């Protein structure tokens, strides 16, 4: 079994064997890194809002509503930003309002 599977490796130098090991690891993870560039999740959006000055309780509320409105693709942090500029209020005021169910019709607008 193993003795046959490895046949094609027998002539590789340790150096070539290591290179092959690492070149293949890179292929295997490459599509995973791509998924990461092109998508987001509740935790990522929650952690963005944490960094923006919101509590864990507030982040959760805002992300749940964002998911409800189907706007995750825009970024939950982006929504708070746009709404802040639009109504010319602070990020936290915009964020607090959103978490309590206000300004979502405007966001959808």
């Amino acid at each position: 079994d193993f003795q046959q599977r490895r046949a094609h490796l027998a002539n590789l130098s340790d150096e070539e064997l290591q290179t092959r090991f690492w070149e293949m690891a890179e292929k295997i993870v490459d599509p995973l890194l791509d998924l990461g560039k092109k998508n987001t999740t509740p935790s990522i959006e929650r952690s963005v809002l944490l960094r923006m000055g919101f509590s864990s309780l507030e982040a959760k509320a805002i992300v749940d509503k964002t998911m409800d409105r189907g706007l995750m693709g825009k970024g939950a942090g982006h929504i708070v930003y746009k709404i802040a500029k639009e109504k010319n209020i602070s990020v936290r005021e915009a964020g607090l309002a959103l978490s309590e169910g206000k300004y979502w019709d405007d966001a959808i607008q």
């Binding site: 064997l17 690891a25 560039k37 923006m52 930003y81």
Partner: protein, 726 residues
Amino acid sequence: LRVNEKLDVENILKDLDKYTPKRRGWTWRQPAENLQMGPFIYKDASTPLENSVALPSAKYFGDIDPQPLPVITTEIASGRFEDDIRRMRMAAWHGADHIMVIRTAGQSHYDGLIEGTPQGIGGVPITRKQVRAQRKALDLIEEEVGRPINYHSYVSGVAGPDIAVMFAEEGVNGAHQDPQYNVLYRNINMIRSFIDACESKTIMAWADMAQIDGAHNANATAREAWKVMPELMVQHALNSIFSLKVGMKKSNICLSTVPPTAPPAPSMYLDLPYAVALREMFEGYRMRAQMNTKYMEASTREATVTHVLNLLISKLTRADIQSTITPDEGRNVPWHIYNIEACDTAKQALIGMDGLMDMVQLKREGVLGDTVRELKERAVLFMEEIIEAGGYFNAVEQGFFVDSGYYPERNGDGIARQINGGIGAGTVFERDEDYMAPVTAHFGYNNVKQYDEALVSEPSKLIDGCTLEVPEKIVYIDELDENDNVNVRMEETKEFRSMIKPEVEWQADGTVLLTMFLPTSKRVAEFAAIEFAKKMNLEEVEVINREVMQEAEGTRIELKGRVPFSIDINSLVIPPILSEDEIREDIEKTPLKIVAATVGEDEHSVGLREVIDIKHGGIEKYGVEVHYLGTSVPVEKLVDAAIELKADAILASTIISHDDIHYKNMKRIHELAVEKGIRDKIMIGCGGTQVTPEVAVKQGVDAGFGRGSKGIHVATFLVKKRREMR
């Protein structure tokens, strides 16, 4: 802190809302080349601590406390972080500079941060408050011992990004993070896991944290761990290259590598080739060695011995971090004293092996080499099949991981996770072209150019700094549960902050350990031991170790139990010594000559010779000049010799005690000395099996010595009395 005063937890807990980490990032130990400590020079030492507790046997070498090269870890997480802070100070003094806090069971399943200080199970609930408290306490501790301590916990689970942000803000120095763990061992959705991991790892990298991977978990789930090496290498490789490509420094990417076997397997022979192969293939990455838990039982001795073998593997190869396991880990939830044992063991073994690789080397060509090449090959083969199956996700759905086979052997009993299943399945959302995230350390696609080309490299400028640039913006939450918190918890034990009781992990928990041998079979010995323990007033009695000495001859039993009462310290009656060196020096400066004999018709010679001969520490050891007249020596002969030989002392033995001939002969020695006018210038010590010191002195002699007397007692008397006489 003051060394003689206990840490004030009550005080540490104040103003946590105002706390900011003093430091950020991971710290390595600093080598101290050719360091001289006491009589010795060290080749593999790091900078000494300012304050610390040396090994017990350091007292023979001036109490030096040399520190080895690797960072030394200890795991401390009892469920009550407020008690744990006290153990951290203990562990730090014993040399641990990496404190790892295992989280409350299943925190991986919390979909977001938790807040406050609820009691934990099998670990500490990780929250901003708890983290601040422990990092603050560690700030004080590390200043006390004089070397930075790395605080460390876990980013695993469905809320990695959340936790990473908090760790980054609060100055956590290192953390576990490995998307493979979430999938394989917690059944978290694999798409969710790897997408979250990109963000988590980006935040960790911003914070210059060390990262430890999840590979140790495959050891635990292996049927025979000596067959799991190819998979370990793959798991290490996938998390390593993924972390590198996200942007972490190789020098912060740490493989969690545990030697796979323990005796009675030929464990060095099985594990050494794997250790070598790993460190050759992963050159440039960090190695975090960790000790055996899989093949471990309830004997602390057996655990300790295997751990030393673990340490030998590290020494023969490389460990940048050497984590430890408490030797009671297979017996009970870890106790204070066993965290300290593990710290002592790692330090003791590694210092013992100082410079070992200057005198010993691997035979890299030979059976070692052959096996190392084979292991690399099986690993490459494993990678080949993953691509052949269409990538990581397919390989996982096909149960390639956690299979009990020795790859390429596949037994078909692995853990298969569904690409569409697991926790958080269906929570992945495509980013639209106008997706935006106004923060630092964001990994994925981020359209900031829609607002401003210039701010692309600093998305947080859009909001005048995120919490990573502006700590002021962080929202601190104290408690959410009125009943389940550290305050309520402390209130319960405030009585213990002049009364004392023993503890093993929590203030006043009353637990003690009882060890005994009972001359009966093991089952009977167990129940009999429980009864002995109850008869000793212990409550909550549990046998926690059983070892057969011989099936019929007897059994060793170890039990734990609670002492149901307390001791008032004020109530204790505590009374208010020359060193061997001091005695020797006193005699070298002022020579001391004695005449000695067993006197009368007594032919028992041994007792006297035993406090004279150097073999068992007789006074010869200190340089006393001894003139030995032998046995059955008439009392007047002895006194006559003392005068003639100009003796400073007479030492006489009386073993036979029939009719009090022993006391009578002492009296006679005294009287003969007085009669010859020398009594005031001579010391007279008398000894014997039936001699009571107090009764001897009443006979007129200077000192009496009975059962169990030693050279040191005799030499001490001679030195002190000669001084009192002067």
